[PDB]
Amino acid sequence: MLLPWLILIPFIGGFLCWQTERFGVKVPRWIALITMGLTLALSLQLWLQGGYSLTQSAGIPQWQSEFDMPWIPRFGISIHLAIDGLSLLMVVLTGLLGVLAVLCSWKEIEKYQGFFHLNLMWILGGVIGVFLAIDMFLFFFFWEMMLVPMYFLIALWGHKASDGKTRITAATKFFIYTQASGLVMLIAILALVFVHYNATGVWTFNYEELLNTPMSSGVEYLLMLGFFIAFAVKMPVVPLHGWLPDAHSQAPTAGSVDLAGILLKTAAYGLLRFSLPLFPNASAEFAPIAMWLGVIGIFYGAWMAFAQTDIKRLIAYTSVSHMGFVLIAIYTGSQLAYQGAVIQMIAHGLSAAGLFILCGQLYERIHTRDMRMMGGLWSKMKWLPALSLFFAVATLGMPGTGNFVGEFMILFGSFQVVPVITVISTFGLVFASVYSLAMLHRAYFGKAKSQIASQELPGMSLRELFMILLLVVLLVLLGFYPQPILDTSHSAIGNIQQWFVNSV
Amino acid sequence: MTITPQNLIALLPLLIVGLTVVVVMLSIAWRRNHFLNATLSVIGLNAALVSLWFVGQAGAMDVTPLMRVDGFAMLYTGLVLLASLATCTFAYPWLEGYNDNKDEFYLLVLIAALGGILLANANHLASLFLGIELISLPLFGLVGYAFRQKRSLEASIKYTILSAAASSFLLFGMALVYAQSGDLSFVALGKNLMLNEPLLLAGFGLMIVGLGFKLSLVPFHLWTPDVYQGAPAPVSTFLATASKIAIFGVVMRLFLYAPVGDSEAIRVVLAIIAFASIIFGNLMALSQTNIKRLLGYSSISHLGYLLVALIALQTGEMSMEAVGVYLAGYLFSSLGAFGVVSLMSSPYRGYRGLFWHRPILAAVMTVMMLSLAGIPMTLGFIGKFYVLAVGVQAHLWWLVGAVVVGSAIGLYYYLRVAVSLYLHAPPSNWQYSAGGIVVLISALLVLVLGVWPQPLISIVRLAMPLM
Amino acid sequence: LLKRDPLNSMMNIPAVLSRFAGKGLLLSENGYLRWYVASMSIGAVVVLALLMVL
Amino acid sequence: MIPLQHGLILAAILFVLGLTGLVIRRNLLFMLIGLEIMINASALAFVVAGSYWGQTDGQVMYILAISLAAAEASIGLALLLQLHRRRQNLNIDSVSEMRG
């Protein structure tokens, strides 16, 4: 019953940031902090109240807390929310990254910050609704309604050093990609609903009703193909990945849009929740293609990330490679691989959040992002080079950080299922270390290659240092003690895996 | 069969619009007063709109050999009456700057609304032809209202010649159909049939040519950007909304009530026309710098989507409500967009950075640009979802693929206009305020019925004709 | 060799195709009335022929 | 006793001749003349259709057809007078400033 409020209080908070903007320029940031603190507090309350550690697996469906309201009764469409361990973990991560995004844009005294904050929490409420909703039309509605504030923020509030045409082009490319993939997902959803109506005779858009749908082979393959095309653009999966570095590079220079918008990957949650249980046989047949797409994504993203002269573009390609690892993890049908996938998504979100925040602050210090114009920056700032060294160490899969735990349980489950893809992915981890070292050496080590890197730069303030140290502590605790996270998602992942491997 | 008083009770909007046409005529002849005749036209249109309630309380009846009145005719009559009311509301501040006479505009708008109502109530070939011509002729007058301006005269000449040619084509196809069947009623086309005979097929093809001209369908679509740009902005609003709504309503009535809709060849050529219309109308608006030509190609694409929803009418029973919902959303979005254009063009003399001097109009314009793209939280998405569901249900995969591709292209140019509203550029009268209120309620209705579309579904499904 | 992102250009190919097709189709809107009537006649012939072949 | 096919063929011949005069002629007056030819041809086809079935519906449709013909002829004549007044020639191919 707290889930409708969990979606709503970001929207009410964004409306309050827009409305209380007339009270002063410095007011809506405080309102946004209060409402994201409240959203994170309710997510943690659901974590402490759900009892996720001692929960068994009763089969799909098994929701810890659900909500029903009729929305379009003509089609049997409901505002239908449901939370379990995986959804709760992603909602907590959403609240954390939303708090970090609000804190990261604290130094803006611009004239129209109210609409910036309104679009930010519209994005946050949309992605929270994607995680919570299981009704197909409502899930699709959140999936495409979180898209408009992303476009507006990238186009209007984006990177000030670039022209308006480049920001407009990047935003339009991202919007066209994501909304066309939403449209083909809607085609798959509609065809699934019509197949269920022809089988039974009742208008159901509900996720639990669509599971017991008899489909011939070939139709289910096409529905799975539409779902995978949507979740492949949104992952990203190559070659459907060109929107990601363009949207990251022309994002706002504070860095809040990267954390709130794209750094929570709804596509892998959609694959775990919708692509695998609704289409078990089609996904089992598609597993070689998806796993080889993951291999190509890992190596392609590494080869991009080594060859980028832009640090933000580099981190975007790190995201491409890590989500290629997650894509390999999804299509194995293993308990250990799925749990490693969950750990890898959480750790990648935290590590890329730290990397994006530190890159934004580096750009604020030095007023450039080209990696050929900077060097020897370890002796020029106080805290930023060491923290970026820690996060670049985290992103290459280092023990003591959750990335190693997630990637290694992914590889253990995969090698239990397929060995060759596992060994090629481990060489992809070698490539990941290569690009992380290249970024570190071309960014902070060496001699000064320009004049802006030859002078002493001001240090980071207390707020940004506190949030970066919070991310560091969270990554260390995830790496050294991931057991509460594994026990939180043990029931839902087990239900999904049992549904996937028991129907084939 | 004779005319009963219940028939005139069901004939309330037609009689009211004719009576207010005569009243506006006599008031113009008495004295040239812009405000008085404008108020008379708005009063007559509102009287027809509230007489729709008494028409609904009467019931569905076949009032003439010509007309049939049901929820279908009621819904389309309400749509064209709303379009005419918005056209008058947008036209008055534009007409405040007209140096010539400003009184014939409302007379022509009322006569075109009468033609639209008669098209909505049509159940006969003669009624269909007369309604098409009664839509077209006041549009000839209104498009070339500012004939001193060059472009208005260009659009008037082009529209008049092309629509006379299309009327000749439609009438020849009508004559061939009547030679085949022998009855001009909408239910007796091919009742004597072996449903495929070349004379009836050729006649229906020529009527398809005429109606596809009137619906801006490819390849009879070349007039649409020219006529839309040349005409005055309230005339562009009326031609985008009321003409398309009425002609597509009578097209659906013809293709539902006749047994010729079961023929596979007409469905195949309609699928070809719908595919070509969607792709051509979306591709032609990629590099359009003018808003009127862009909205004309938008009208071509949206009528292609309506064609896709119409093709699957014989298989599924949910196509008609899909067309009703899409036409309501398209009417509201076109009203908002063309109303912002008209308020920016008013008063008549002779959009980059619009938010920095006119923020509410920019908000309405970007909401309607989001709505026309089929983006959620808007009514155009609900219409596109209905069209896609209807196409999926009857297994029209080429058409839904064309819908997805055209929606992506429309996304590109609509969102380009939307961001151009918010870039950096290098009235004071209650009629202009009334136009602003009209476009604001249009945007609010689009947003509310995008979030919560179910009441519109209930109203549309309650508008159920004789199956 | 890969720093130009070849897959991005491979997926940007249909955007170029859409732009080229739109610019080609915009040449038909030359603004001539006799061409519009001729195109209406061409479309009538095309739809009548498609109805006759089926 | 008179075939319907011959009357329909006559009407079709007149219709396509009117369309030929509509397309190939550049002066606006001859386009209006060709439009009159097509509307008379469609009306003629309606009269043959009504005479084959022995009904007055074809004649009523002819009446509606020529009412439309007269109204469109008056409207086009007024528009042509406007074009000749503000351009001083009846070249219809110069009406091309609206393109793209």
Ligand SMILES: CCCCCCCCCCCCCCCCCC(=O)OC[C@H](COP(=O)(O)OCCN)OC(=O)CCCCCCCCCCCCCCCCC
């Ligand atoms: C897995 C493959 C099969 C399934 C595919 C499902 C669809 C979803 C996933 C694929 C999406 C592909 C999108 C490709 C275009 C992305 C946007 C883009 O590149 O825009 C570039 C450009 C706008 O940028 P700008 O430079 O400002 O404009 C030039 C100035 N005249 O744009 C323009 O100038 C015009 C843009 C027009 C709209 C975009 C083109 C859409 C065409 C239909 C594509 C449908 C999918 C086809 C199959 C995949 C591709 C082979």
